[PDB]
Amino acid sequence: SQFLKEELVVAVEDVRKQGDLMKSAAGEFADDPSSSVKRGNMVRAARALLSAVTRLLILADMADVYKLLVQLKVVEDGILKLRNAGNEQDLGIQYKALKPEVDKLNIMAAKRQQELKDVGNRDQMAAARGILQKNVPILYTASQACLQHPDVAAYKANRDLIYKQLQQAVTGISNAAQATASSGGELAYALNNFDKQIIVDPLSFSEERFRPSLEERLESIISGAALMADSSCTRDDRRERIVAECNAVRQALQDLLSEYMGNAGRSDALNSAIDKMTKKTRDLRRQLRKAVMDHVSDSFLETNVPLLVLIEAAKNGNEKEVKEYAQVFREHANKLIEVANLACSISNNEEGVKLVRMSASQLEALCPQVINAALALAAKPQSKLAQENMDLFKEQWEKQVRVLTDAVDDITSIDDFLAVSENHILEDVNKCVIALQEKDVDGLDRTAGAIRGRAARVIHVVTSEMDNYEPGVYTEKVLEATKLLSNTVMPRFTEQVEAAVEALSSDPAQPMDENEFIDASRLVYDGIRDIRKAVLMIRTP
Amino acid sequence: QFLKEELVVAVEDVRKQGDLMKSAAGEFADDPSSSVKRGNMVRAARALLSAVTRLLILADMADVYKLLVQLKVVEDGILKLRNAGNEQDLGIQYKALKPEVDKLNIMAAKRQQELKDVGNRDQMAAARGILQKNVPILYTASQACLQHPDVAAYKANRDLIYKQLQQAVTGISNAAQATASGGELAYALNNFDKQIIVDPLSFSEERFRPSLEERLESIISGAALMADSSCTRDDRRERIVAECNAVRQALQDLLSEYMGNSDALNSAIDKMTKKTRDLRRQLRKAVMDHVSDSFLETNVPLLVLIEAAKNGNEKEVKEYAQVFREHANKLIEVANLACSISNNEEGVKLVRMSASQLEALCPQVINAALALAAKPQSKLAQENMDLFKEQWEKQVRVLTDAVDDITSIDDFLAVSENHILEDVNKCVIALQEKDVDGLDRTAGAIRGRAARVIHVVTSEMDNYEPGVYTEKVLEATKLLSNTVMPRFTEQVEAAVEALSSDPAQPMDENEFIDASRLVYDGIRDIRKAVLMIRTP
């Protein structure tokens, strides 16, 4: 940092000389507000002084990058040392001297991130700083669990996983800072392309052998749409409708194909075909929206349930049940990630797609860590620190699930969720009244749980999409309907269901009032519908 | 000019900030090792930079407004120059215009070199060049519309020039205004080659497919413009399509290889760079293809139109105007194509400026033919056609030598040698088949391409300074011109004489083939001589 200092003093002397020149020229113009020459000399000095100041400030930029490289190498060595800890005394010291350098690095890297220009590097820098700050205090506890219970290898796997993520964050900072030289969804991009790429006459030899076949674009679009509609998370309803829409958007293209193949005239018969094609593409767009809303309303319930089953089986020292429920938990996490990926696919917003994919990837990286933490707790169940690790990883899991949930909420339309959840909760209150009408205790319990979960989901979604607007009268009425369904309708419905289940599962079968139960169910539905209409007022399209 | 108030505001601001920065820099240099004083120096430097950049953008906006007012002045003065009724009033409006038009041209040059864009730069350059070259032409068009008020051709020409100047001033307005954002296709091609790789480990399959696929498709469109062109050989565009499919396959292969991560995937990247370089070479070969194949006959439709308009035919001169327009468009195509792939930025600017100038000049010669066919006896028709043909041939050779200086000479020599070998075999086989039109056309083509070679090597050997390398190739070119073309034109005309007559005598076919192999070997020899610069 010495050559930089000398050349920076050089540049600052340059800048002071230019400032003297600029002051002289400006004082000379200040006398003649009319001389087009004094004005010319003023601007000619301004440009050169601006160039000199720019030289100096880019020297300062290079100096800050120089400092950040060695700070990053310092924290790299510190991470390597905190990993290679011997006992809880050397480890407890490596942390009391790494946090200062970690914080200095984080601040300098935020500075350099604000100094960047390319936004991909901005986000790489932000994610690297975030992973750094999240994993250093977690690498501490992982190394502590390694050194206290060295008999379990799951702790070693977690220590090494967090160390690898930390080194990846180090290298990400390095490249996002050093490299100073120089966005919608996948299905939405191709859908808008195919919407616009059907306006040219392809009988010519200029866009039938160079540009892609207007059939191949549709075929890859169908590949994506049937990838979504074949997901294990898709209902049969959306699947049938997506099949219908794919076969109706291939018929509107074959109609358009036989319209452009026989025209080749610079025509009107093909305007009907292009309008039909536009409308069929818009309809398949809407159907993919309906399918992803199906996914959001369905799979985003019982969010932290496999985790709870896993930790409850791991609190009891079990080993094979832990592996079974851990494979199940990995599967459910991958189900969440697949749903988030489909919703990222059909989405147009550039920022939301990035947040969704990044949060889902972080949750995917967290999945094996909490699996190993549950395994290591079950391996040493009568341990304090294993219990603490399990608690920490369960809280991390709940937080990551909540942030992925909010990302998918904000990346999608509010009233679409309102309507799909309204119809689903109607189907479910019907399932509930039916399970009661035949005294099906299991069906009644399951359906009431589904109804309550969907209600709480809708309340969280409505309160999340209600903060995007200013505190006003519309928000007042909407949040009033929300808290009314909150503190009234759902507790009443729950008490009704509990009374019915108690009346069924008793030594004397008690004839509960079947009338008020149905009233609480229809109250759930009508509250959902009321809130839906309340949110559906401040917009006209 | 009412903004000078904010100017003095920003001047006082910049003075205060510069004094503050000089004080802070003195504090730093007096204590060269202080994290606080250095920080304050940098803070003051950034504040001073913000102040002087505010001042700079204020000055640029003042520049822009004064240019807008000058442009409105020139526009209204041109409106006066067109509607002038007297030659006295036309002279007075031109007297009041010429300095104001020069002022507008200088200001437009300033705001062109100060444009934050690279394309609107060229647009306004061409527009103000049109305004620079056509106002003195509107003067004479109006003088000849006020001196022959009967011939509607003179009025059509005057008003065509007026509409062109109005397009020029509106273009200057639109270009210098909206600064809101090498060559057309070469830029995207080199940036494709820049974006082929980024980061192996943090590589997402759904974050780079848009960039790479869309870049590939834009490149494919830019190359299809050149391959599927009015003047580009069939085999050439088939070769281009082959290389386009190859580069598409290579892009998809590079995508499927970046799906696996950074070891064995280097081969896919090398194949990608190979395919993009080979497509670059095929496009350059296509440009060189329609250079020798289109620049050999420059004044043909002009000459035929001039003769058929001097004779006064109406239908003939109209068909010749259409062939003249087809020729001008066929040449503008080659201009834009050779521009879109060259990295010589200033050369591209010059070529495109000359190309738009000639594009505007074409309908002027059209209306000159209009004036000649309608009044062939009239005194002013001769001078009108003479001026416009002079300007036309001037701009033709200007665009020729302008594209010559963005086109590598060695590729020109290669494509010219292969093309004249092709035409010489055509000529031989037409002499053995005894085709009078065949020999006529083939000898014309060979002689024209040889003259093309002569002109390009003459215009290229002046960029060097006379030495052994200079004279060694100058001798070959002089030998070609003053030896083989005589001995070839002589043989082919002896053929068309003895064959297209009664005796049908064998026109000494061995000497004919001797002259043909002579012209091939002479072009090849000039090539071999001038190619003694470097090997890598």
Residue numbers in the entry:
A (entry chain B): 83 to 264, 274 to 357, 361 to 635
B (entry chain A): 84 to 264, 275 to 354, 361 to 635
Task: Provide the authors' own sentences about this structure as they appear in the paper.
In epithelial tissues, the cadherin intracellular domain binds to β-catenin, which in turn associates with the F-actin-binding protein αE-catenin. Specifically, αE-catenin functions as a force-sensitive structural switch that displays two-state catch bond behavior: it transitions from weak to strong actin-binding states between low (<2 pN) and moderate (8 pN) forces. The structure of αE-catenin comprises a series of α-helical bundles organized into three main regions: an N-terminal (N) domain that consists of two four-helix bundles (NI and NII) that both binds β-catenin and mediates homodimerization; a middle (M) domain consisting of three four-helix bundles (MI, MII, and MIII) that harbor binding sites for vinculin and other protein partners; and a C-terminal, five-helix bundle termed the actin-binding domain (ABD)18,26. The interactions of αE-catenin are allosterically modulated by binding to its protein partners and by mechanical load.
